[PDB]
Amino acid sequence: SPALPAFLLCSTLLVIKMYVVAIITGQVRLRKKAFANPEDALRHGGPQYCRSDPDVERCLRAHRNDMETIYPFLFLGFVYSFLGPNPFVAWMHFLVFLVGRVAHTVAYLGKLRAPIRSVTYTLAQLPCASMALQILWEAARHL
Amino acid sequence: SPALPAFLLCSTLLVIKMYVVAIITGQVRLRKKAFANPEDALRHGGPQYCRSDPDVERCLRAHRNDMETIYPFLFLGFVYSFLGPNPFVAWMHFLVFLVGRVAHTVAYLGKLRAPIRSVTYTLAQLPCASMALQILWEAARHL
Amino acid sequence: SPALPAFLLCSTLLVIKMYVVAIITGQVRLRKKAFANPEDALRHGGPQYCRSDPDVERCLRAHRNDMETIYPFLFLGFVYSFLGPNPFVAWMHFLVFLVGRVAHTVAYLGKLRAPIRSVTYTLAQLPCASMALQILWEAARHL
Numbered sequence: 001s002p003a004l005p006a007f008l009l010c011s012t013l014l015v016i017k018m019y020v021v022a023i024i025t026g027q028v029r030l031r032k033k034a035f036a037n038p039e040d041a042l043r044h045g046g047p048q049y050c051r052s053d054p055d056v057e058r059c060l061r062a063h064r065n066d067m068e069t070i071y072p073f074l075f076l077g078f079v080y081s082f083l084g085p086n087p088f089v090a091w092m093h094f095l096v097f098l099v100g101r102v103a104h105t106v107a108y109l110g111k112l113r114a115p116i117r118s119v120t121y122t123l124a125q126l127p128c129a130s131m132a133l134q135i136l137w138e139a140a141r142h143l
Numbered sequence: 144s145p146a147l148p149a150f151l152l153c154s155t156l157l158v159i160k161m162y163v164v165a166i167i168t169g170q171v172r173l174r175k176k177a178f179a180n181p182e183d184a185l186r187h188g189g190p191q192y193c194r195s196d197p198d199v200e201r202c203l204r205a206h207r208n209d210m211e212t213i214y215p216f217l218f219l220g221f222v223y224s225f226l227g228p229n230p231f232v233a234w235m236h237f238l239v240f241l242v243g244r245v246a247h248t249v250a251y252l253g254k255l256r257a258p259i260r261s262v263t264y265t266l267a268q269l270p271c272a273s274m275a276l277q278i279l280w281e282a283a284r285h286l
Numbered sequence: 287s288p289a290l291p292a293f294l295l296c297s298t299l300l301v302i303k304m305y306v307v308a309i310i311t312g313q314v315r316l317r318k319k320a321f322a323n324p325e326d327a328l329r330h331g332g333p334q335y336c337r338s339d340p341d342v343e344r345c346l347r348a349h350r351n352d353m354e355t356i357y358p359f360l361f362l363g364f365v366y367s368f369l370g371p372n373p374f375v376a377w378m379h380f381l382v383f384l385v386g387r388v389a390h391t392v393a394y395l396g397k398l399r400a401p402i403r404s405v406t407y408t409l410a411q412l413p414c415a416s417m418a419l420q421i422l423w424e425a426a427r428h429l
């Protein structure tokens with residue numbers, strides 16, 4: 001598929017981007033001394049450190065939003081790649097998603113003013129919606 | 144694959160169904176004035192609106208359950224499609240999952256009496272379990 | 287693909303492992319009488335049972351970590367299988383992930399001392415990182 005290399009590049013970068021969030025989460029837990037498990041807290045200073053922290057919670061929300069958005073893209077974009085779309089159009093779909101999602105993480109973890117984060121979220125969803133509809137038509141017509 | 148069009152139809156509809164939940168979540172946050180981020184709250188009335196809401200939490204639980212169930216289906220159903228199953232049997236697997244999952248969201252967000260939601264959850268898991276076992280046998284025998 | 291049977295075996299076992307966590311979660315909710323929904327609580331003893339429980343929360347954290355790690359593997363490992371890697375090397379990637387993830391669930395739900403869980407988490411991520419980089423190179427060179 002001509003679109004597949006671009007899809008695999010963008011998707012893998014987004015998986016790596018999620019791994020970055022996972023690592024940041026751990027770093028914040030250690031720095032802020034905020035653990036979700038007693039066994040963790042007892043290792044890292046005592047039971048008083050089994051507690052919630054706003055920065056940790058923020059990291060978790062960013063990671064969750066990633067899972068809600070990037071995982072569908074992994075599916076939709078893979079299938080879309082094999083439908084034989086216009087190369088440039090396909091690239092635009094993938095680039096809008098990649099840029100939008102990277103911007104989303106920056107806006108979330110960087111605590112940027114509203115509605116920057118929400119805009120990046122919505123924007124990145126648009127190529128996903130587009131791919132979804134295209135797959136729907138292709139699937140339905142092949143029934 | 145003869146089963147693949149039906150799989151792609153059901154899967155894409157389920158992705159769209161998850162997007163519907165994502166949009167509803169936002170609508171409920173705005174209507175109930177309940178935001179998870181201070182930057183959101185300050186935009187939408189003040190810091191007192193950085194708060195939890197039962198309806199918002201319900202939306203999040205529905206979306207989470209979707210991610211726990213639909214994402215495995217996206218994987219299992221794709222692989223299963225290429226194993227050359229009986230067309231009608233394959234359709235039944237996909238339809239049970241689709242109907243069960245749509246019913247699940249309705250039961251969750253509609254606050255239907257127990258155990259309606261839990262039944263739909265369990266029911267929809269059954270075709271997934273079936274596909275999983277079939278893939279296990281095929282994979283193992285090809286080792 | 288020569289690596290594909292091993293990938294499909296390990297992946298399906300991990301999906302089943304996640305289903306086990308889902309079932310355990312339900313069992314713990316019923317045993318500890320801790321429900322997230324009023325409709326559930328009213329069915330199972332009264333409104334006082336709409337409450338949080340540490341064991342339930344632990345189950346949810348284990349399931350969430352699974353979704354953060356196993357879902358990327360489902361994607362990365364599938365693509366990696368088609369890149370024509372060394373059979374034994376591919377097997378090692380998949381086995382390290384499988385063993386690491388099973389150990390992770392045991393360490394989490396079994397409340398094993400730190401840093402056993404965190405080590406298993408980190409260890410299992412290493413083959414994923416490896417596959418991600420390999421896909422990046424292949425994708426980039428095919429642009």
Ligand SMILES: O=C(O)[C@@H](c1ccc(OCc2ccc3ccccc3n2)cc1)C1CCCC1
Pocket residue numbers: 019020022023025026027029030035040403404407408411412415
């Ligand atoms: O939740 C936990 O178990 C801990 C924890 C432990 C390890 C973490 O990143 C590993 C990781 C994540 C992603 C990777 C991607 C590629 C390669 C290695 C990777 N490695 C994060 C949190 C925290 C709580 C106690 C101490 C920190």
Ligand SMILES: O=C(O)[C@@H](c1ccc(OCc2ccc3ccccc3n2)cc1)C1CCCC1
Pocket residue numbers: 117118121122125126129162163165166168169170172173178183
């Ligand atoms: O969490 C947030 O960032 C906000 C928010 C912002 C946007 C939302 O839906 C976008 C969306 C979702 C799914 C889509 C699927 C297809 C096409 C467009 C799509 N667009 C939801 C919540 C809420 C908090 C502050 C205001 C609401």
Ligand SMILES: O=C(O)[C@@H](c1ccc(OCc2ccc3ccccc3n2)cc1)C1CCCC1
Pocket residue numbers: 260261264265268269272305306308309311312313315316321326
């Ligand atoms: O959250 C809920 O809806 C309930 C609930 C209900 C059912 C559950 O496992 C089903 C399941 C899960 C995974 C499967 C995998 C294969 C085959 C059947 C499978 N079946 C768990 C929790 C709990 C709250 C009220 C009572 C328990």
Ligand SMILES: CCCCCCCCO[C@@H]1O[C@H](CO)[C@@H](O)[C@H](O)[C@H]1O
Pocket residue numbers: 017020021102105106109110111
């Ligand atoms: C893909 C991973 C991107 C990580 C984005 C990290 C954004 C760091 O941005 C930082 O955010 C802080 C608030 O959290 C601010 O105090 C700093 O001014 C800002 O530099």
Ligand SMILES: CCCCCCCCO[C@@H]1O[C@H](CO)[C@@H](O)[C@H](O)[C@H]1O
Pocket residue numbers: 160163164245248249252253254
């Ligand atoms: C795929 C998306 C399906 C959305 C299902 C929304 C269900 C709306 O159902 C509504 O639920 C309310 C309680 O929340 C009740 O007050 C109403 O009687 C009922 O109509």
Ligand SMILES: CCCCCCCCO[C@@H]1O[C@H](CO)[C@@H](O)[C@H](O)[C@H]1O
Pocket residue numbers: 303306307388391392395396397
């Ligand atoms: C793939 C699913 C694996 C489930 C792992 C369950 C681990 C059970 O392990 C149990 O944990 C208890 C604490 O929770 C301890 O009291 C027990 O000593 C221990 O046997």
